[PDB]
Amino acid sequence: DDAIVAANNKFTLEYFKACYDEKCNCAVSPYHVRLALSMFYPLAGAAVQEDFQVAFGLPEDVHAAIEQQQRLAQQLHDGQHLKALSFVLVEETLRLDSEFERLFHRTFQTTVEPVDLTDDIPSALAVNSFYQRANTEIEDFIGEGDVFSLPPCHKLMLFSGVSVLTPLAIRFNPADTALELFQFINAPTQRVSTMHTTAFVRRCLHNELRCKVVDMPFDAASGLSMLVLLPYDGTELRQIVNSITPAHLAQIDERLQSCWTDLKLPKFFVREKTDPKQTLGKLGYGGVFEIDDLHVFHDSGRTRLNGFIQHCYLAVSESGSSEFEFHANRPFMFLIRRTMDGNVLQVGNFSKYIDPDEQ
Structure with a gap:
């Protein structure tokens, strides 16, 4: 296995x-x-x-x-x-x-x-x-x-x-959701519904990959979690996507530590x-x-x-139930993983503005 x-x-x-x-x-x-x-x-x-x-x-x-x-x-x-x-x-x-x-x-x-x-x-x-x-x-x-x-x-x-x-198992409060800028590749000043909370999440910096990392768990019964990789300022998402290897995932797993985090997504x-x-x-x-x-x-x-x-x-x-900032307001990569073994089940990126009234 x-x-x-x-x-x-x-x-x-x-x-x-x-x-x-x-x-x-x-x-x-x-x-x-x-x-x-x-x-x-x-x-x-x-x-x-x-x-x-x-x-x-x-x-x-x-x-x-x-x-x-x-x-x-x-x-x-x-x-x-x-x-x-x-x-x-x-x-x-x-x-x-x-x-x-x-x-x-x-x-x-x-x-x-x-x-x-x-x-x-x-x-x-x-x-x-x-x-x-x-x-x-x-x-x-x-x-x-x-x-x-x-x-x-x-x-x-x-x-x-x-x-x-x-x-998600993280408690975002809809009273705290507001229209905020997201730096979409095709619409760098477009504002979209943005969630905000203070959560005690596993997080780390990864200076070699040039990104912040948070591991955002789903409901406990799923055994799944979403790793979000947010490039540092001055770094393109393409650099993270092309750079990342399993060795980086292993380093992330060793470095992640739970920390009260001001989270925006x-x-x-x-x-x-x-x-x-x-x-x-x-x-x-x-x-x-x-x-x-x-x-x-x-x-x-x-x-x-x-x-x-x-x-x-x-x-x-x-959800219906700080020493780090993670404000995902620019394109990011995500990995859906089984928490027990780190196996990656789904991977993707969020970069583009798609107007739901249009498409």
């Missing part, structure tokens, strides 16, 4: 560096990218099995890899606190192979829906309705364009939703659709999308994965 977490954190930060765009807000879960894609490892030929061994550290013992995926996925998905749900579309006119059925219908925690993948309307509706019924705060998971193809149409597509739903959310197929390609792991290597169907030949879309959600809000 120590090795799995170490490897996941290293991959998570590399993946985030490959998708971060300083002009946009982002939330991704590389861990769930790994868990969802790993379901195809037992079905994969030599080229893709090698890719997944390199990218994710999967066991060469495929039986052990299946058991590992099951254990890790069950630990991650946690009811009311964090929902991590995969969904698979398969072309309905192709009979499935018996091992795919065994694994995807009767082994892995996932849902497979056969659809007419030549028709983007029912294909998108199957995905969107699944995530709506899952009550995971993502009501428009994909658009029709995300599943569309001209002939020869797609045969196989994968989806990951990761939603952090647990409330926008009342924010991030709900962002991303494309693991593109990001994994950038990291050198495009093989599963570029080589026809997965044994899914009975009599149509091995297939590539035609698409993999992820949609993540996180929001913060006030």
Whole structure:
């Protein structure tokens, strides 16, 4: 388990560096990218099995890899606190192979829906309705364009939703929320609802990374916490995002100390659709999308994965229950971690002003 977490954190930060765009807000879960894609490892030929061994550290013992995926996925998905749900579309006119059925219908925690993948309307509706019924705060998971193809149409597509739903354990008082400037990259003087409290939070300075750090816990029952990295003045968020490694996370864990902190944070959310197929390609792991290597169907030949879309959600809000200042009034990075082992479950940034009356 120590090795799995170490490897996941290293991959998570590399993946985030490959998708971060300083002009946009982002939330991704590389861990769930790994868990969802790993379901195809037992079905994969030599080229893709090698890719997944390199990218994710999967066991060469495929039986052990299946058991590992099951254990890790069950630990991650946690009811009311964090929902991590995969969904698979398969072309309905192709009979499935018996091992795919065994694994995807009767082994892995996932849902497979056969659809007419030549028709983007029912294909998108199957995905969107699944995530709506899952009550995971993502009501428009994909658009029709995300599943569309001209002939020869797609045969196989994968989806990951990761939603952090647990409330913060820090008591922000809404009487103290006010419109305050936030230095958005696209609107440096825009004012937005900004929460304020005095909290006894774990905090540190990190002079090498050039940021202040607070670890903001969620409700105790979730076992989760949000590390917020706020660049020092005169330092761009991109420098923190590109610099950070697991070694820095370890140093932060050693340096954090609980301290009465004057905390200011926008009342924010991030709900962002991303494309693991593109990001994994950038990291050198495009093989599963570029080589026809997965044994899914009975009599149509091995297939590539035609698409993999992820949609993540996180929001913060006030609670119904000083020797450091942490005023997050400029772009920051966040990491959602399991407190017990430090495993990073979701990572992102808040940088851009999105007017809710406009979009």
